[PDB]
Each structure stands twice: as structure tokens, then as C-alpha cells.
Amino acid sequence: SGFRKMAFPSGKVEGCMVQVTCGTTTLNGLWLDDTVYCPRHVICTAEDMLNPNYEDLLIRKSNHSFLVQAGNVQLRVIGHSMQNCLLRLKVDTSNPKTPKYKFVRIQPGQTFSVLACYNGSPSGVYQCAMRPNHTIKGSFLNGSCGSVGFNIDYDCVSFCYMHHMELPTGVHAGTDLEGKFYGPFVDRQTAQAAGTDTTITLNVLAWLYAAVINGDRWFLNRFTTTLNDFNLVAMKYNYEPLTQDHVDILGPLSAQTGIAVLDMCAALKELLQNGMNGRTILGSTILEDEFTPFDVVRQCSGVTFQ
Amino acid sequence: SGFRKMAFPSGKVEGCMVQVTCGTTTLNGLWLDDTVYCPRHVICTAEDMLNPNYEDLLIRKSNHSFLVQAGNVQLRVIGHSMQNCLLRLKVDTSNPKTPKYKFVRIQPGQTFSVLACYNGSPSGVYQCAMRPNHTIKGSFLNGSCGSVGFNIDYDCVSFCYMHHMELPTGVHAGTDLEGKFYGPFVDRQTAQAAGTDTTITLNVLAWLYAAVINGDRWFLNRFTTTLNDFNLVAMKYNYEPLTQDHVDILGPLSAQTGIAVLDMCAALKELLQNGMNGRTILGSTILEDEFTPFDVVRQCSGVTFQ
Ligand SMILES: CC(C)(C)c1ccc(N(C(=O)c2c[nH]cn2)[C@@H](C(=O)NC2CCCC2)c2cccnc2)cc1
Numbered sequence: 001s002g003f004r005k006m007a008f009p010s011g012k013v014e015g016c017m018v019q020v021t022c023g024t025t026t027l028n029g030l031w032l033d034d035t036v037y038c039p040r041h042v043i044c045t046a047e048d049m050l051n052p053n054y055e056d057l058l059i060r061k062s063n064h065s066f067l068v069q070a071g072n073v074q075l076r077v078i079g080h081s082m083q084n085c086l087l088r089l090k091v092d093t094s095n096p097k098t099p100k101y102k103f104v105r106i107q108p109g110q111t112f113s114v115l116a117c118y119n120g121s122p123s124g125v126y127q128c129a130m131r132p133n134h135t136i137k138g139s140f141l142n143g144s145c146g147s148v149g150f151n152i153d154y155d156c157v158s159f160c161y162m163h164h165m166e167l168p169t170g171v172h173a174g175t176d177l178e179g180k181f182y183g184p185f186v187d188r189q190t191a192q193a194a195g196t197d198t199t200i201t202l203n204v205l206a207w208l209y210a211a212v213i214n215g216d217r218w219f220l221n222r223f224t225t226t227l228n229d230f231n232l233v234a235m236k237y238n239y240e241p242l243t244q245d246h247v248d249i250l251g252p253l254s255a256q257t258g259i260a261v262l263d264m265c266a267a268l269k270e271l272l273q274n275g276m277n278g279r280t281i282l283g284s285t286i287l288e289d290e291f292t293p294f295d296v297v298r299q300c301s302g303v304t305f306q
Numbered sequence: 307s308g309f310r311k312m313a314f315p316s317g318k319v320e321g322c323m324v325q326v327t328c329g330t331t332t333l334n335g336l337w338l339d340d341t342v343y344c345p346r347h348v349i350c351t352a353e354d355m356l357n358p359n360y361e362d363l364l365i366r367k368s369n370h371s372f373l374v375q376a377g378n379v380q381l382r383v384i385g386h387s388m389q390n391c392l393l394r395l396k397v398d399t400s401n402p403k404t405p406k407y408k409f410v411r412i413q414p415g416q417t418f419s420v421l422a423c424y425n426g427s428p429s430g431v432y433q434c435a436m437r438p439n440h441t442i443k444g445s446f447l448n449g450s451c452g453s454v455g456f457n458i459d460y461d462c463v464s465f466c467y468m469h470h471m472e473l474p475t476g477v478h479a480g481t482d483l484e485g486k487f488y489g490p491f492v493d494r495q496t497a498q499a500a501g502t503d504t505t506i507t508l509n510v511l512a513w514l515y516a517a518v519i520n521g522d523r524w525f526l527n528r529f530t531t532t533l534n535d536f537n538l539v540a541m542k543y544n545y546e547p548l549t550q551d552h553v554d555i556l557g558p559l560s561a562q563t564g565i566a567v568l569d570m571c572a573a574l575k576e577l578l579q580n581g582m583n584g585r586t587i588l589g590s591t592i593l594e595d596e597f598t599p600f601d602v603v604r605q606c607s608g609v610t611f612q
């Protein structure tokens with residue numbers, strides 16, 4: 001029993017974290033086989049983060065401009081190239097701890113684990129959702145850049161996020177492992193701000209199903225709704241519209257609990273309109289949107305507490 | 307910026323997890339040097355968990371009654387002994403991944419990371435507080451027994467918890483790594499239930515200091531309180547009394563923010579009496595008690611956002 005934000009075990013990623021220094025700037029990098037990936041802003045001067053030209057800054061560097069440290073061992077850089085907002089540094093040693101891995105680009109609403117690192121040293125792990133506005137609600141201090149986000153399936157690490165910067169509201173922005181930013185953000189100091197966010201409806205529904213699996217039904221009702229009628233309410237409460245594709249995704253959870261998706265939508269409509277009346281669901285006084293249907297299936301029992 | 311429940315990186319512990327089987331019962335064990343630690347209830351029959359006599363059950367076992375598997379490798383048991391509610395199985399191989407480690411008994415209100423494991427395979431990591439009633443609000447399914455809790459300081463793993471059982475309310479009970487239960491619980495099926503819990507006042511105060519460090523002061527006020535006057539209110543709201551020792555612990559956070567401890571206590575008194583009026587603190591609509599003063603110092607910047 002229980003239901004917590006649960007991260008993946010971080011050991012396979014810990015063995016990949018290194019420190020990269022260029023000039024006076026140090027940050028984290030990710031060492032897989034004979035390549036080290038890191039944010040390209042490692043080459044950026046202090047006095048000009050307002051308007052860097054990365055092509056012009058990088059052509060002025062040699063391989064020995066970069067210092068890469070794996071623990072207390074120096075890795076010699078033998079090549080370098082820019083890919084989007086990442087640098088790829090070729091090193092003279094293949095990481096003997098490289099796990100089976102893939103690079104994936106994750107979609108808004110999907111979750112991943114973050115290994116927060118400083119100076120190439122892992123410091124903590126936590127689970128995050130990619131918000132609809134393409135930010136994450138992380139916990140990062142100066143020098144956390146280059147920390148990565150990932151999911152693990154059958155001992156294969158799917159890397160999906162590298163941290164680049166903090167926005168004015170204290171939330172975080174970064175790229176996939178091809179160096180393409182999530183959202184409309186850029187790697188320079190500008191006035192950019194996160195856009196308005198929205199609540200991830202599919203995840204709220206998944207979490208209400210988790211509550212039923214774990215034995216709680218207090219918030220159900222005798223009503224149903226049409227998709228369109230629910231979406232009229234969702235707009236009023238800044239929830240994402242529900243689509244037929246999202247209804248289909250909830251099929252297995254609906255089958256395990258015997259609660260039709262549109263019947264759960266009617267329960268959610270009532271909770272939005274009337275509130276929770278001082279009660280809790282899975283220990284929470286608010287509706288939670290940072291668990292996906294997959295996360296619920298991963299964590300909950302496959303047998304409902306009827 | 308940000309503030310999350312952050313676990314320690316789990317890799318040093320992952321390399322210690324093994325599977326232990328006796329008869330038809332399988333659970334997790336912890337392999338350090340040439341010893342495997344696991345719950346002694348691994349030797350307990352299905353048809354008699356109501357009244358096991360562990361001395362009488364264990365004398366009927368040999369070394370080869372126990373099967374220990376580290377990944378796909380079998381470890382031969384060459385000795386066994388009971389220590390309180392743990393079994394210590396001596397094996398023929400010293401774990402080459404044994405980290406620097408210690409066993410510690412943690413006090414109520416203190417936090418630790420849990421590596422949830424099934425069949426000796428790590429599945430997830432999360433951060434927990436030891437409640438005043440000696441339970442934890444974990445997330446554990448059948449077969450999670452033997453999963454461990456730990457903290458990490460300068461690459462030394464301090465193991466503090468091994469999971470034994472789930473109580474009727476869905477919370478979890480276990481032992482230190484000497485096999486002594488936290489709380490008044492026993493390793494058999496009885497009517498036992500968690501006692502009434504209480505809110506960890508020292509942790510709430512630490513988290514209000516975290517909110518000031520991160521830049522938010524909305525909940526402060528112009529009042530102060532005496533320790534005794536605060537404790538009268540704490541009793542009404544099921545908060546633990548504040549002691550002078552706990553005031554002293556808050557010294558460094560008070561110094562970093564310039565807010566005297568008893569002045570923060572006055573802020574907390576007002577929040578208990580008046581509520582939060584629809585506002586949030588560090589993203590939360592409720593007062594949070596699962597971060598210790600040490601956790602706040604570990605995670606927050608050492609420079610207040612003034
Ligand atoms: C060069 C530029 C791309 C503009 C950049 C500058 C600073 C940082 N940041 C670092 O900490 C860092 C830089 N180099 C090594 N570390 C911090 C940051 O984004 N500050 C913002 C305010 C000014 C510019 C952006 C930070 C703090 C906490 C978490 N994540 C990042 C990142 C990017």
C-alpha cells in the first residue's frame with residue numbers, strides 16, 4: 001500500500017556523471033562510451049551571456065580548452081563538436097560503466113527522474129513531470145547545469161533531459177540529449193519567461209484510479225458526462241481538454257477498477273465544482289497531476305482493494 | 307531555486323541488494339562484505355504467521371535451507387545466526403561493491419531514503435520521515451520486505467531501516483540493522499496498529515525557514531511568543547511541544563534569515579490559528595513536516611534571497 005512520487009534507482013546514471021570545465025566555468029557532463037555531452041554554454045564568458053554567438057565562441061577553442069574529470073581522473077579531450085545546444089566532447093577513454101541506453105524526447109505531461117549533480121558529483125534524486133508549459137519544478141542550485149533526467153525500462157536508461165537554466169519564477173528549462181530545447185527557450189540571458197501552465201487532466205484521472213485501486217471510493221458519484229460537457233468544465237478550471245485518445249489510454253485502469261472513464265470524468269467534474277470538503281485522496285488535500293497512467297500501473301498493485 | 311523531497315543517489319545501495327529464499331518465501335536481503343542481512347520472518351511458514359517461535363523454526367534449518375541470489379549468481383550460505391529480528395547469513399563471497407558503511411538507529415522525526423526492491427531487484431527510490439508513531443508512509447507491495455533505508459554522508463552509507471511489514475492503515479514498520487524494531491511492533495500477525503501520530507514541529511519550523519531562504523516572507527508577523535505560550539497552542543493542534551534543545555538546533559537557519567526562532571514560532575502560531583487563506587508556501591497549500599533542519603541546509607542555498 002501507499003503512493004509516493006518514486007524516482008528510478010539512480011546508480012546506472014551516477015556512473016556516467018563527470019565534470020566539464022572551460023575557462024572559469026564548470027558544470028556537469030554525461031559520459032557514455034567515448035563521448036561527453038554537456039550544455040554548450042560552458043564556453044560562455046561571464047561578461048557576455050546576454051548575446052553569445054556560439055559558433056564564434058567555439059571556433060576559438062581547441063580540444064585542450066576543455067578539462068573533463070571523472071572522479072579524480074582526467075579524461076583527455078580528443079575532439080569536439082556542437083549539436084544544437086549541446087557540446088559533444090570525444091575523449092580518449094570509453095566509460096566502462098556505460099549502461100544500455102537510448103536518447104528519447106519526452107512529451108509534455110510525461111514524467112522522469114532527475115539526478116541533481118554538482119561539480120560532477122551526484123547529490124540527490126527526485127521525480128518530475130514535464131509541465132505543459134515545457135518547464136519542470138526542479139530543485140537546482142548554481143552549478144547544477146548538465147544534470148540529466150531519465151527513465152529506466154528493463155535495465156535500459158532512456159535519457160530525456162539535460163538541465164540548462166533557471167527561469168525568473170524559479171522553474172527550470174533544458175534540452176533533450178540531441179540538444180533541442182523543450183519549449184521556446186534559448187541558452188542566453190533574455191527576458192524569457194515560462195508561459196501560462198495548465199493542469200494535466202489525464203494524470204489527474206490516472207491518480208483517481210490509483211485511489212480506487214488502493215481502496216478509496218468516496219469521491220465517486222452516480223453521474224456520467226459526455227466528453228464535450230466535461231471539456232466545458234475543464235476550460236473553466238484551467239485543465240487540459242480530454243480527448244478520445246486519452247480516454248483510450250485509461251482503458252486498462254478503467255478495466256481494473258470497473259469504473260468507466262466518462263464516469264470517472266463525472267467524479268472529477270464534481271470535485272472541481274464542489275471541492276474536496278476537507279477530505280483527502282491518497283493523503284493529498286489537492287488533486288495531483290504529476291503521475292501518468294504508466295506511473296500508476298508501475299506503482300500500484302495489479303489487484304484492486306475491493 | 308525550488309524545494310522538493312530529494313532522496314540520496316541510490317547506486318551504492320543497489321550494489322548491495324540480493325534475493326533470499328527459504329522454502330516458498332522470497333524477500334530481499336542486504337549484502338555487505340561476506341554477510342547477508344534479511345528479516346527473520348523469511349523462515350516463517352504460510353500457515354503459521356500468527357504465532358511463530360523463531361528459535362524453534364530456525365533450529366530446524368541448515369545453511370542450505372537458504373538460497374541467496376545476487377543477480378543471476380548463487381551465493382553459498384556457510385553460516386547463519388539470528389540477531390533480534392534479523393537473520394545474518396554468512397556467504398562464501400565478499401561483496402566487491404560493498405561501500406563504506408555504518409549502521410545507525412535514527413530517531414523519530416529524522417528522514418532517510420528508501421530503495422524499494424522486489425525479488426532482489428531495485429525498483430524505486432523515495433524519501434521518508436520516521437513518524438513520531440514509529441511508522442513510515444512508504445509505498446510497498448507484497449515482497450518489498452528487506453528493502454532498506456539509508457542516508458549518505460561523504461560516500462559513507464549509514465543504513466538505518468529494513469522493511470518488515472505493513473500495518474492495517476497501509477503504513478510500514480521495520481527495524482534498524484541490528485534487528486530492533488522501531489516502535490512497539492512485532493514480526494508476527496497480530497491486532498497491532500499504529501498509535502496516534504503527531505506533527506513534527508521542528509521540521510515545520512525548518513521548512514518555514516526554507517521558504518524565507520528561497521525568498522518568501524508573506525506569513526511572518528510583528529509578534530513574538532514565549533516557549534510555553536507556543537506549546538499551549540501546539541497541544542491544541544496536535545503538534546509536538548517545542549523544547550529549548552530544538553530552538554538551539556534552529557540557530558543556523560535563524561542566523562541565515564535574521565528571524566529569531568521564537569518570532570518564527572509566532573508566525574507558525576498565526577498560521578495554525580488562522581490558516582493559510584488560500585495561499586501557498588514553497589508550492590504547498592499545507593504545512594510540511596517531513597524536512598529536517600539538516601535537510602533544509604542540504605538543499606537550500608547558503609545565501610538568502612533577501
Ligand atoms: C549563460 C546562461 C545560459 C545565461 C546561464 C547562466 C547561468 C546559469 N546558472 C548556473 O548556475 C551555471 C552557469 N554555468 C554553470 N552554472 C543558473 C541560472 O540559470 N541563472 C539565471 C539567472 C541569470 C542567467 C540565468 C542556474 C541556477 C540554478 C539552476 N540552474 C541554473 C545558467 C545559464
Ligand SMILES: CC(C)(C)c1ccc(N(C(=O)c2c[nH]cn2)[C@@H](C(=O)NC2CCCC2)c2cccnc2)cc1
Pocket residue numbers: 001331332333347350355446447448449450451470471472473493494495
Ligand atoms: C509473517 C509476517 C511477519 C506476519 C508477514 C507476513 C506478510 C508480510 N508481507 C509481505 O509482502 C511478505 C512476506 N514475506 C515476503 N513478503 C506484507 C504484509 O505485511 N501483510 C500484512 C498483512 C498480513 C500480515 C502482515 C507486506 C505488504 C506490503 C508491504 N510490506 C509488507 C510481512 C510480514
